[PDB]
RNA sequence: GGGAGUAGAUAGGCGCUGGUGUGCCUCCUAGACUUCAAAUCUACGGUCUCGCUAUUUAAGCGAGAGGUGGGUUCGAUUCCCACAUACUCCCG
RNA sequence: GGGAGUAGAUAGGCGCUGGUGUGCCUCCUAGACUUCAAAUCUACGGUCUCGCUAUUUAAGCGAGAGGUGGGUUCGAUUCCCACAUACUCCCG
């Protein structure tokens, strides 16, 4: 027992084995981790050999020297992929962020008056113009955007909402569970599938401080189903003197039909010009910018929200703020194609095949590869457009040696890693989400796994 | 004087390491080598000590200590704790 | 790959039954009968593995396997459960 462990060398001795091989710091860390795995494996009597030690210690070093979060090549064809980090950023934005983070900036400083200033002041100019709302505000994310409006205007008082709009988006967010913690009392009207206007108007009373509607972003209902029109709820509010609050969620900044895609998804400008008092949404969904809770509406309300002592715990960071301004700057200049998420969904059907076969031309040489391009209909929107179904070209592949399952697995372990769909033992690569500079990296990773 | 930080050798200065210590530089001594010097290289080397044989001394041989003590642990130079000391910083 | 639906013999295909399994069809065979055929009819029949008796062989017989195990029960081929395996459909 006590000889199968004395064996394990000394950390000073393996540090030497890797003089300039690897940084001394990373070597000792790998030696300790490895030194402990052999002390316990020999104590339980499951190891008789120690030759695996030297080879392993170097593997920990090779592993411990790489950050965990890593860029990932998305081949699934889902633009708003909740799991892969939603809306990706254009180089233009990322450099504007790079520069403001490089050194000091006038984040909370107004250069004119030479005294402290509100950091939320830089942006709001853009929002008010783009939406048409009276005033605006921005916080960490939309989850908090909701929580803030409720605790600001309905703490202790009733909020009416349709029983079909109490959603569970994400793993931890649930309108009913957060609104609870929001301090607002929840008044659910109508039924799951159907909800008329009479349901809303019927539950109003002395405590009703808010009429709230949530947009079913991550799901939808078909069959016998009724919903309350937006113009109707504005009318109902202005009748009793109650505010209207729409949680768009998708955070669509513009009309979407303007780009060829025909859908009813709501957007700020239009929802604002409808008579709604407040509107919110995430910046990293249909806006295509960094994570951000966006609120626009009546000035008297925005000012009530801002003054809330909880807004300081949600106030946005220096990175997303800047990055959001450049994203908004692009919107004013109509540079639509510059923002990843808008370009990916409004891409020419022709455009997609053009990239579908430019990849197939790069994989015909690789050994054992069965390459075919198929025209499939998928659902692009992951966290904002549930029903949408648009055509896109998938380059379906298949190797004689390895199986589709094992294939996805190694591809997610590659550097860079690639995540893709699987359908009937045929790995699939949706080109709707693939950047050009990835095509070269796709071919170089597949040739390293099948010819190695 | 009161706190706190940095700390520690078993030739000497610095740095490291849960594997019974070790690497860099220096000193010393020794060896190798070198026309001379230098350079270079090497050392289960060195301190203290104690104990053993002889015992005037010489001479040969064996063992332990890491400021001190304790603890964890298969194993502590490494880690914890307590006290001491050195250097430094703040206060009366 | 994950779910789910269909499932299973003790000659072989289909159907049934809490009564120690059974009906239709086939196979194999066998027997009966008819001037001849043809037809028809009939069968406490049948596998495996092991074991047993006789033991040259025959020949006869016993056990269990109804995928495997378990349970309920007076009795399980039936019912349930678990695992595994075969056919099909939904999802990643």
UniProtKB/Swiss-Prot annotation:
Enzyme's top EC category: transferase
GO cellular component: cytoplasm
GO molecular function, one term: identical protein binding
Classification via InterPro entries: PyrdxlP-dep_Trfase, PyrdxlP-dep_Trfase_major, SelA-like, SelA_trans
Cellular compartments annotated: Cytoplasm
Keyword Cytoplasm: yes
N6-(pyridoxal phosphate)lysine: residues carrying this PTM: 285
Major localisation: cytoplasm
Reactions catalysed according to its record: L-seryl-tRNA(Sec) + selenophosphate + H(+) = L-selenocysteinyl-tRNA(Sec) + phosphate
Cofactor: pyridoxal 5'-phosphate
Pfam family, one: SelA
EC number(s) given by UniProt: 2.9.1.1
Known pathway: Aminoacyl-tRNA biosynthesis; selenocysteinyl-tRNA(Sec) biosynthesis; selenocysteinyl-tRNA(Sec) from L-seryl-tRNA(Sec) (bacterial route): step 1/1
Example GO BP: selenocysteine incorporation
SUPFAM superfamilies reported in the protein's UniProt record: PLP-dependent transferases (SSF53383)
Keyword annotations from UniProtKB, A to Z: Cytoplasm, Protein biosynthesis, Pyridoxal phosphate, Selenium, Transferase
Homology family: Belongs to the SelA family.
Annotated function: Converts seryl-tRNA(Sec) to selenocysteinyl-tRNA(Sec) required for selenoprotein biosynthesis.
HAMAP family in alphabetical order: SelA
NCBIfam families, per the entry: selA
The protein's name: L-seryl-tRNA(Sec) selenium transferase
Originating organism: Aquifex aeolicus (strain VF5)
Gene name tied to this protein: selA
